[PDB]
């Protein structure tokens, strides 16, 4: 005879992302070969972890100058994808796409100041802990925080922790949850010379664990 | 915990040629500027070189400057200072040091080897 089956109930819609494909139309077509095509990517994270792109400060700039005040806080700025000052960046243009995020997020500073001009600086990254960011150059030392002097180069890379509770962190920072999402970032100037315009621009990349998780659609369509 | 552990020390005629070894443990090996500390007899601890650890790039002392070569091995977690055209002035002990400061100052790295020691016989 014949063999005999049992029409299930519920299943044979169509999903948006079924993996079964479709029946061919028009057969036999062989298109030219697209090999040894230059500036081929398969990976979104590996184009956002080659080539950094630019901070944008305050007034629409992506350089931060120094300031001939007794605040030596040069600037703060949140470490989150959706801040302000990463609002300009290829990693948040990416980051907005998915749900959840875990690794590394690289920093990198370049002195575009005279040469005759010498300078000390710091850096400090404070994590989600007290209720304050140590606007005090010396309380924060106490953080995680790295020393760099612009007599033996003009390029300085500093690598920003993972620290969170959970093993995956949201991307997509919730109108609840007030005071210091997670993490801020303080440049202070330990010393200048003859640094009234010089000028210092600030990039930031992908790290080398970086890692995006669940893609989704957000936007308003 | 961050441990540095240096070898490749000796006595060496002036004018040849040593390489000294930086082995690393640790999670953090990635994140740190490596370079290397020099502390003549009776003298304080001197920056002679350090390395990057993302482009890789190269910084040496004005003393050394041409005539040394310092070297990073991710993999193996090893930093090394390859040692050219050597003079009696280099006689000193060679501490291996990392941080995520890159400065010529001594104090504001944490963490510091043992030790090795080079002797330049001229």
């Known amino acids: 005879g014949i063999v005999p089956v049992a029409c299930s109930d519920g299943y044979g819609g169509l999903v948006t992302t079924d993996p079964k494909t479709a029946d061919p139309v028009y057969g036999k077509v062989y298109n030219p070969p697209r090999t040894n095509y230059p500036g081929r990517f398969t990976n979104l994270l590996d184009v956002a972890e080659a080539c950094p792109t630019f901070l944008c400060f305050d007034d629409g700039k992506p350089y931060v100058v120094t300031r001939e005040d007794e605040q030596r806080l040069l600037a703060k700025f949140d470490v989150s994808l959706a801040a302000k000052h990463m609002s300009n960046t290829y990693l948040s243009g990416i980051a907005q796409y998915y749900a959840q995020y875990s690794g590394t997020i690289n920093l990198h500073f370049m002195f575009t100041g005279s040469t005759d001009s010498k300078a000390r600086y710091m850096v400090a990254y404070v994590p989600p802990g007290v209720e304050t960011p140590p606007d005090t150059p010396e309380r924060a030392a106490h953080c995680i925080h790295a020393e760099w002097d612009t007599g033996l180069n003009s390029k300085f890379t500093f690598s920003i922790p993972y620290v969170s509770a959970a093993d995956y962190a949201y991307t997509a920072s919730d109108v609840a949850e007030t005071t210091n999402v997670q993490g801020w970032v303080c440049i202070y100037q330990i010393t200048h010379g003859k640094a009234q315009n010089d000028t210092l621009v600030v990039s930031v990349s992908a790290g080398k664990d970086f890692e995006l998780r669940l893609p989704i659609d957000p936007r308003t369509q | 915990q961050v441990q540095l552990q240096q070898s490749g020390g000796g006595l060496v005629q002036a004018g040849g040629s040593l390489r000294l070894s930086c082995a690393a443990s640790?999670?953090?090996?990635?994140?740190?500027?490596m370079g290397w500390f020099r502390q003549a007899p009776g003298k304080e601890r001197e920056f002679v070189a350090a390395?990057?650890?993302?482009?890789?790039?190269?910084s040496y002392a004005d003393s050394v400057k041409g005539r040394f070569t310092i070297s990073r091995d991710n993999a193996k977690n090893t930093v090394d200072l390859q040692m050219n055209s050597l003079k009696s002035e280099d006689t000193a002990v060679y501490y291996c040091?990392?941080?995520?400061?890159?400065?010529?100052?001594?104090?504001?790295?944490?963490?510091w080897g043992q030790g090795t020691q080079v002797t330049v016989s001229s």
């Open positions: 040091a990392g941080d995520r400061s890159l400065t010529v100052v001594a104090s504001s790295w944490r963490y």
């Open positions: 640790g999670r953090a090996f990635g994140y740190y500027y």
């Open positions: 390395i990057s650890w993302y482009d890789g790039s190269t």
